[PDB]
Paper text:
In an alternative crystallization condition (space group P6222), two MhGgH protomers are present in the asymmetric unit, corresponding to molecules A and C of the tetramer observed in the orthorhombic crystals, which were modelled from Pro5 (molecule A) or Ala0 (molecule C) to Gly446. The active sites of both molecules contain only solvent (apo MhGgH) and adopt an open conformation. In contrast to the closed conformation, the putative catalytic residues point away from the active-site cavity: Asp182 is stabilized by polar contacts with the side chains of Tyr191 and Tyr225 and with the carbonyl group of Arg216 through a water molecule, whereas the side chain of Glu419 is hydrogen-bonded to the side chain of Ser435 and the amide N atoms of Met432 and Thr437. The two structures of MhGgH, apo MhGgH and MhGgH–Ser–GOL, corresponding to its open and closed conformations, reveal the structural modifications that occur upon substrate binding. In the open conformation, Gln433 and Gln434 move outwards (with displacements of their side chains of ∼11 and ∼8 Å, respectively), leading to a concerted rearrangement of loop E and loop A. Loop A (Arg21–Ala31) becomes mostly disordered, with difficult-to-interpret density that only allowed the modelling of two conformations for the segment Leu20–Leu25. In this short stretch, the contribution of Asp24-mediated interactions (with Arg21 or Arg58 of the neighbouring molecule) appears to be central to the overall conformation of this region. Moreover, given their spatial proximity, the conformation adopted by one subunit determines the position of the equivalent region of the neighbouring molecule, potentially impacting enzyme activity, which is in good agreement with the cooperative behaviour observed in the kinetics experiments [Fig. 1(c)].
A glucosylglycerate hydrolase (GgH) identified in M. hassiacum and found to be highly conserved among rapidly growing mycobacteria is likely to be responsible for the rapid mobilization of GG accumulated during nitrogen starvation by hydrolysing it to glucose and glycerate. The MhGgH monomer displays an (α/α)6-barrel domain typical of glycoside hydrolase family 63 (GH63), to which MhGgH belongs. While the active site of GH63 members acting on larger substrates is located in an open, solvent-accessible cleft, those of MhGgH and of MgH from T. thermophilus are covered by a cap domain (subdivided into A′- and B′-regions) with constrained access through a narrow negatively charged tunnel. The crystallographic structure of MhGgH revealed a homotetrameric architecture, which is compatible with the oligomeric organization of the enzyme in solution as assessed by SAXS.
Residue numbers in the entry:
A (entry chain A), C (entry chain A): 5 to 25, 31 to 446
B (entry chain B), D (entry chain B): 0 to 25, 31 to 446
Amino acid sequence: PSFTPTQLAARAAYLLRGNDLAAPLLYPHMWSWDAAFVAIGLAPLSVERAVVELDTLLSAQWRNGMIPHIVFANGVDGYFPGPARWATATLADNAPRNRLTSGITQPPVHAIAVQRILEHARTRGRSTRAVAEAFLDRRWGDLMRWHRWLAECRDRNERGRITLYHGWESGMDNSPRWDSAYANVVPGKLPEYQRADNVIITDPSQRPSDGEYDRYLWLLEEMKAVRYDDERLPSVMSFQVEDVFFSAIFSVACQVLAEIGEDYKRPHADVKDLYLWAERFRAGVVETTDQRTGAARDFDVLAEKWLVTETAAQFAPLLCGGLPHDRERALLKLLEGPRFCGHPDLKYGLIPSTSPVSRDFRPREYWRGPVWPVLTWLFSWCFARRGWAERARLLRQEGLRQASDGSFAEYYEPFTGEPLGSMQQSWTAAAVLDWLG
Amino acid sequence: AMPHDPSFTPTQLAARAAYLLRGNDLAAPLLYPHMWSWDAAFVAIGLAPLSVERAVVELDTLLSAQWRNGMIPHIVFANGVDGYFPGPARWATATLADNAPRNRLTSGITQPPVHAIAVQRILEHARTRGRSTRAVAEAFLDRRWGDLMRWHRWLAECRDRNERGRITLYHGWESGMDNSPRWDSAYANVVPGKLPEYQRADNVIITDPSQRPSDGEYDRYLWLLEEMKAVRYDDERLPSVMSFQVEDVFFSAIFSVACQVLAEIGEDYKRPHADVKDLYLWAERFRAGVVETTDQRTGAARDFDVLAEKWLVTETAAQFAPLLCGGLPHDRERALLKLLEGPRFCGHPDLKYGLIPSTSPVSRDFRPREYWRGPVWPVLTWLFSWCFARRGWAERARLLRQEGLRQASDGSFAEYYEPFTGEPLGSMQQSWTAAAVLDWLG
Amino acid sequence: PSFTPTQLAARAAYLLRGNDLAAPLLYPHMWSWDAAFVAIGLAPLSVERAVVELDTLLSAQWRNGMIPHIVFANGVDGYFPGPARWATATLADNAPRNRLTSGITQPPVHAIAVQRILEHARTRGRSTRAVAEAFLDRRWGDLMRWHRWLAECRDRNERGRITLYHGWESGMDNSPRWDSAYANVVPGKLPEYQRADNVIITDPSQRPSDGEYDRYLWLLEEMKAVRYDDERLPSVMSFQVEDVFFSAIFSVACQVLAEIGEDYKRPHADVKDLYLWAERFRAGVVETTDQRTGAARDFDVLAEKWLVTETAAQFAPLLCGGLPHDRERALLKLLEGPRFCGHPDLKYGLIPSTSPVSRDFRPREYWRGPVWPVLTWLFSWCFARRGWAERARLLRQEGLRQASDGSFAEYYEPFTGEPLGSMQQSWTAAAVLDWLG
Amino acid sequence: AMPHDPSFTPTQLAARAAYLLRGNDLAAPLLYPHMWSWDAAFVAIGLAPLSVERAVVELDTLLSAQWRNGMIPHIVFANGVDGYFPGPARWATATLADNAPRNRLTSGITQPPVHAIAVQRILEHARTRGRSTRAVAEAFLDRRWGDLMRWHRWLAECRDRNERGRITLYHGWESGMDNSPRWDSAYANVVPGKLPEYQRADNVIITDPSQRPSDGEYDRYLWLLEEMKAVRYDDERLPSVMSFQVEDVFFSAIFSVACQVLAEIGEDYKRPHADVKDLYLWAERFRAGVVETTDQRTGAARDFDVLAEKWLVTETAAQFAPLLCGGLPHDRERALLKLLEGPRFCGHPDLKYGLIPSTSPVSRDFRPREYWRGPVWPVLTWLFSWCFARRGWAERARLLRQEGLRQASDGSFAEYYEPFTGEPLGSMQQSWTAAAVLDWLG
């Protein structure tokens, strides 16, 4: 029990303020994903600072609503791919006037962070209440424009699933999920840049698991060749796969944002649209599932085949609901049984990223096996929102038990508990702070 | 109706404290890269609950600026180029003080010895944390024990040259409590001459507002510096030239507590028997020295102006010095506890909380918005609650801690508060209140 | 803050063990309602003792499935109405062989207590786990037979609402809800008994609010005249009203017991029936509601009129779900607005039993105004089960704040906080223990 | 892997403790309506967190059975008709003891004076609870102060007739720790004669198993009773006739702690100055009396057989008596703490938890399943942690409490546990462990 709940919350917040304190090289840029989770970690201790994190992200939102996956603080510190590689400032009609951003997106966890800010703000008085109210007044339209872009421009055919054009957009790129989609990307001659002819991809979780690095950059070249135009990307992109996990998060996020719109008297037509997308994508997720187990499947749009992999993404339906009782029960059995949380070799009953009995299991490599506390955080938060109060409590209790040595790595070896790596911000610290406070 | 839930639960409050620990940017003060002896000790106290290694790094950094004779100076300057005043140029310790450290810019005065308390919090937390962290705490003590002994030895030998068991201060700044009724009459006898012409403006503001003289008699404060410089900060010569020499009874009691604490550390970690004996000897010298000052009926302690040869009588929290270190006979301690808990201090009916006011609200010197002339400082309550616990006053300790946590639960993390309205009044460079809260909770 | 959470849990459990310690005269008999809540209060500290409380109740279950509202420990201590007045031993074909019981029922909170026992049992090992498993193996059939009796014999016309034949069956008799139904009960000459010609009703919450005591006993005489025969009661009873609160609890209880059957591999046909009743009664509750506010209405079956009263029973739909978003939002506004929890004169934001602005409001008289912590407990537990995690948390936080003086009365004056009375067992202690532990 | 969550959280555990407080019916023991002096004190300690009035009623009931000379007897019988043995018939105090209370059946021996500790827990909790409950606690003290003084005065005057500062026991039962190596050699010198023929079976079992002689030498135990009866329990005559007279150094230290605690209560509630002075005087008499027994190198305390005129040397937790009351010179206290924390006691590597074993596992007398010959009693750890806190040993106190709570978290609430396996071994009439847990948490 190396840290008590107060000591652990103190250590988590210290490891979110980032000052003084192997660790990773920290860059000044801002990540869509990290921003949402820092906001969730911040809301317990500072609503103002949580609001500033989202305000800063959202001021880099594209004019069509897309939130890009990175916002660069500059173009000289050698981050790759950087502003020079993406070139959205000159190429994309919708890149913002005064911000440098990438040209891909990231899962819509943002409405979850907004809900955390508003919930914590309501218990804190008048001044802080008005800070959260002011944020909502200033950013509701932008959150709506983000959800509307995903629904209209990444579900052009109203199938209720979000289409990804890069594994990087999933949040879960070093994963078995995409291996077969990526295997059909065959790159040509990459153009000549001023960067080296072999520049290392800076974020190591974004490196391809087999150094097939041209594949990843070739997708960028296809995006740039149509200037990131959402109307033209389906004609030229070599990677087009409907991500069923992203889709379920989107459904949850639409339901959360609708409930926010009703609690805070937002325009009724927006609430209706939000409710409608939430049910559209709930059905889209369910449409992918196995008839026996309920497991969700990603869909390779180009290959026209259900991708079949044994990762945590299978459990997408448990986040957003929609399964019939029998198949939801089936799927919970899978989640809690020996292929996942009940695998007898696991040190803790957190969710492994890939099933230890899968052929693709790699106990040390990112989402191919290792345990990520932020994944268990997300399930526990979604379970509580679905009414699975005691399932949510047991996950939270298990996440805290694992986190209480105060290591705060972002992923751990699923059998030995060894901490395996840290991200730019500590998603695990944010998960622990939300769990405790 | 039963009290409403505070803005912050204990885990939320501990998180907010850890987030703010090295400065409340959440009206905020101007932050400098320099390191303060007092702030460093309390940041180390706040850090030990959440990271022993980071706490150790804070004291390692301070102690590497120790003077060759053992004095820990009140500031270590990160640079002499950002305009903090008085800075390296005004102090000129690097050229004038033989004992100033070779590769470190510092001031030439000292600060209360709360460091042994910080070391005790580091070692106490480290013991519970597994052998790797236990090792970083033992490595620290092996490397810094000599240094902590030499600090205490300097205070006992050079600021109590006549073995009276009280620490002599050459400036109100050395007390940690400068803006206070305690020193007004001693300052009123400092009469500056023609101050030398420096390269700064002749009007140059003292950067730290808690250090500005309450009356703007700023020449007085800077004149004491010139006296120190005139004798090159030589401990043998300062008593001949300083216009300010007062025995600080609060500093003296903290020193007594510190020697006792360090001595217990020295035994638990097989430090040299001769150091421990010395430490225990000083702890008793200064305990009795504190008691020697006390009022015969209330037990209240008194500072002593060495030059005026006069017991200074003021009604500030410094009167309760004997409660920290012990030593009072039983009936005067009860008397003094009655004074502390009664209507002149914690039981004053206008106080929002029962934390200790820095000056008694019924005193003529009471100013409810000015630093130590009345306002409530959580770090003072923390210091009392920690000392009460070590004296075996378990319930008194518990109730101070409870009351400090009640007051901190709005998350304001100011260093001092209006004692009647609870309005937060100012922040220091590091948040001592955040450190107090982290220790109380962690 | 007169008691800390540990001190308050200790005091609550002391005031549930009943020994040593104005207060009420405690009788050796066992109440259906009190038994369920004592079990909920006991599960945190002793699963075994919780199981013994329900086992003891259920061994007095009638052969048709009805759980009676009282189980008498004897017929000599002068409780009235006692075994001699009810006479179910000689009259009712289904009264149990070796137990003395009343001839009326009580809301089905029992499945909620069973869920608390199983949840707490799972975290406590092997021996205690087997104790809860053994209970379920022994009592699942009986819980099914209780739910089946309510659905088949108190909803004979499959309207999805439970019919009551006595205000005493509602759990909420001293209430504005029934005043107009009771006003149409006109009694004849009551038969001669050996008891006095004026025996005080022992439980004071069961006394009629206007000493029209003959009305209450006359209903008993109608039940006895057809020997409590469920097939004949609708022909002879002068009080027949569909209780929409009881109905919503029943729906929640069916959903809870179905989820129990799935977690603990109970027979699948039972789970199907449970799910079916849960949705039948959810719809029945919704069918009563106001088109503007969503407020639920009780139905007087004989008068054929919707009873319109401004009590907490209006909020029945919030317990079991089923309203459309707009009307659920409307109804939450009513609950949280100035007619109820946000009435500015209330000392705490617990739910008043009747709206302070209603004409029927009586700030000192049982369910006509006063604040009952067990009512707020039930809403908060149902809210958490519906996913309203932060609404559940704020109610629980408010209930604890009110309870932390350690007074443990069952109801309080809604404006001054004055404790107004104690029941046989402390439902409030059970609520506090569940909230804390 | 990081430790798994215990069967009970602190609120659940506090609830379970309060539910069990007056007897673990959840293998359970046979419960009698009688009241035990020792159990009554600890039930009052367990009750104060949850009900001051109920705690006050528990001591009021005990104290109404006090003898006219101040002795609190170890049992108050609710009746003499349920067959508890030895009962009113065997003790015959109602006819033989001039000082036995008029309308209350009691035994004729005493028990350690832990009552002042219970009073301190009642008053401490009452102070925080509002004026109505503050009033019921002041009313109790007004009514029972004389009585508590007369109890302490009886112990100081009649069980330390020669002002040696140690309490003389006339039976192992009076120690609260009868089934223990501490008394084996003193018992081995009791040689019974023809025991008188009573109306019970000649074989009649001692009802309380912790009171049965370990060796079934039951004649010895009952023979001491006959000696007491032969002199009508007269304090002046018992030293002439008793075959068992040993100074109990643990009882003596608890008495010293008790006098100190009661004296602090007497000042805080304006009790008579002469009572407080007496209390402080006895507290120091018995502190020094305890220290007088101690080993010269370890500081371990020793019981003294008055008749054999011999220091009893046994390796039980009673050696640590000086840690409770203070008084040891600094270096022998460190020695004795090294013994307590080291491999013969808390640091024994085979122990499941670091609670204090009743007998050292390396002793030849160590029996791991037999009462005080080895097993772990949470109430002993509670008593040490409470005394450590009053001595200012804040961290040692905290770590005992933490360790006791760790061990109690399975909810077993036994009074003593196998020290190697943690297996619960037996319950008393009231759950002292439940009271310890409620105090630690409440």
